[PDB]
Amino acid sequence: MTETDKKQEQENHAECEDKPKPCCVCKPEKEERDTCILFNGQDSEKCKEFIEKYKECMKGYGFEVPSAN
Ligand SMILES: [Cu+]
Numbered sequence: 001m002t003e004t005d006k007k008q009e010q011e012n013h014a015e016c017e018d019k020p021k022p023c024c025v026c027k028p029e030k031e032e033r034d035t036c037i038l039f040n041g042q043d044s045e046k047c048k049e050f051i052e053k054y055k056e057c058m059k060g061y062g063f064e065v066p067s068a069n
Contacts, residue, residue: 016068025063029054 022030033050040047058065 018066020064020066023063
């Protein structure tokens with residue numbers, strides 16, 4: 001029995017989905033980032049500051065991050 005379509009593609013937003021399985025070691029900074037982008041609008045320094053601080057606090061004895069390298 002054949003079929004027209006079934007397999008879903010599902011693409012990403014821009015590039016690199018990031019975020020593996022954010023365990024319990026990561027939660028507060030996450031809320032701080034969301035709030036920062038909520039009030040600001042990501043139009044403030046691109047909020048890259050929180051991204052770097054996060055990747056810096058996680059890549060070092062933190063947990064795990066896929067990234068795009
Ligand atoms: Cu975590």
